[PDB]
Task: structure prediction
Amino acid sequence: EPVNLIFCYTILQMKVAERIMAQHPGERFYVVLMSENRNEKYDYYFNQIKDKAEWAYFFHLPYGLNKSFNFIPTMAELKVKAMLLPKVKRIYLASLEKVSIAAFLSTYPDAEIKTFDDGTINLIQSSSYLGDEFSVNGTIKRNFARMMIGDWSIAKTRNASDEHYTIFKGLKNIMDDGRRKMTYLPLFDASELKAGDETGGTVRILLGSPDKEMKEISEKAAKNFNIQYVAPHPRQTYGLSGVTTLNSPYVIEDYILREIKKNPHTRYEIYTFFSGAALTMKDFPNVHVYALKPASLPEDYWLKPVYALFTQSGIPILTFDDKLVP
Amino acid sequence: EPVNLIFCYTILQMKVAERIMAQHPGERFYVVLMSENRNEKYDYYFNQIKDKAEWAYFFHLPYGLNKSFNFIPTMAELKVKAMLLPKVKRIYLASLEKVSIAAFLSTYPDAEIKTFDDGTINLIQSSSYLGDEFSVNGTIKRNFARMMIGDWSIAKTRNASDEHYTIFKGLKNIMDDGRRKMTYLPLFDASELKAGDETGGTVRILLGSPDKEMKEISEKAAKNFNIQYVAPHPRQTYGLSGVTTLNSPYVIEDYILREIKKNPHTRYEIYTFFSGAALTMKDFPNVHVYALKPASLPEDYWLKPVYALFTQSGIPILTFDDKLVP
Ligand SMILES: CC(C)(C)CC(C)(C)c1ccc(OCCOCCOCCOCCOCCOCCOCCOCCOCCO)cc1
Ligand SMILES: CC(C)(C)CC(C)(C)c1ccc(OCCOCCOCCOCCOCCOCCOCCOCCOCCO)cc1
Result:
């Protein structure tokens, strides 16, 4: 059964929402209240909404986000809003945030706009969305491809931006479309690591999967390849019995750079189920990345461009026969 | 000195933000992190940003808002996102939220869209933005008019919506442009109040101003017209010595409707510095609204259309010589 959405930003609008809901007693409503404000009156009507809707959510907004008024403003009110406004010469944002925060961008038409990579999604070129795995209408992959094509077109054409920073050296970017300056921005510093010959031990680390059905495969991989440590994925909710979990406030990239400087003679091996962090770390000194492709998973668990990016990057892809591990 | 804005939604993007900031040591940055997630890693890098930026803000987002991925998603990840997605048959929102949440609307291209009034701002017709008080370039009023013209054009033309609900009976709406059905939605029920002849006392209530420079004028008005009570504005931070403040979880409209039913013989008088709530309450039984126009304020404290709306609505405008009150 489909749902109806209601979006409100004042109390009277919530009263209007209630009237609409009551005229449609047979329909499902999710109601979102957005406000910069907090008080007893807002709570009373929001609680009524909570009681009456299938789902209700209060979405707090930073004070001063809205430059408009639901009421007719006085001169005093116009003046306050006009000088709270920071004067904005430039805005930097992820390339796909040109889609998601386009309405805010449009309120600063004279600002210079520059983008940076969203992440490894920038590495899938336009043409890849046109084959054969994205080709069957109705499918989840087709719908994905259609969404991405539409998003990149918006990012590349609206709210013109004149430079794009990429953190990926030597892989073509979806934003490299000749309408902006491409600038490589090395995120990580490797000079001054002072890394030497690998005459010390070997330290093996598995990059944990945020996907809970990968738990047994992960444990099997650790046993099979003798991997002592796991770097848990930020969005991972489980542990790997018989593997030591690394606990650190750093992202894996910074953690490894810190370890290299501390242990300039240690061989570091990073094993991964095609994690995007691999693509940033392949060029670190004394670091050796291996992608694991478990035989029990379908060929299409990963999108085809993933296999190609890993190979273009010089990262070995290892068949892992996980059913041969107890 | 103008500022630069940075918008981030991942940790690696915050690292990119830091690099950009460090290359511009002489410039001012405000950085916004938007995330659905919370953890120690996000905090570490956000705290670095806090340390390095002039201003930094974490803007929490509801889980599942973003249908895209900064990384290349697996089949499992595509599946999870595809079925968290509520199927949406219709979206109701304030007319100007068609501008502010346009990017979200665009992700539901087959949903039926209906709007309702933002508030009294709907009562200023297109033509009013074209005269003479909005006419001098560079001014705050010109910039306001330009913004509103642009916003209403977007609301009226993009993401077509087929009906608009107004709570204002007998005042023309900016959205009544022949491209949608106008529907009057009476917010308040007045039958069943069972209000009778005004044979009881008179209760006078001043609607408080959210503007702190109105404190003395408000106190003067209360003394001058013998107003016993003030209904504080939701966004009002001060009190009126010698006036009883009403304390209620209801908006003034509901509060008065409750009082009328309880006291069907009482004359209620509402005094206001052109508050928009007056426009909803003029038609309540046993309620008499008076707008107060203090002589000490400039003629242009209120926008010209305000005076006209109050008169079209049958609301007396009373000159208040506030300098004649001690
Ligand atoms: C405190 C501050 C705002 C000065 C700090 C500043 C400038 C750094 C800042 C912090 C955080 C920011 O977040 C970016 C976007 O966040 C998404 C919020 O969805 C908005 C929902 O609105 C509902 C209320 O609609 C009222 C009607 O409006 C109509 C006019 O709208 C014009 C479009 O502007 C709306 C902003 O668009 C939001 C998303 O792009 C943006 C800017
Ligand atoms: C839990 C739930 C989401 C399922 C509930 C649901 C559906 C009722 C709901 C609750 C609350 C809602 O708020 C509406 C808008 O709020 C403003 C948030 O500014 C967004 C900032 O994004 C930064 C991350 O960009 C990542 C890149 O993306 C690119 C693709 O974007 C396509 C455009 O979609 C973005 C949504 O646009 C937001 C404002 O319109 C909307 C919907």
In short: Residues 84-326 of chain A form one domain.
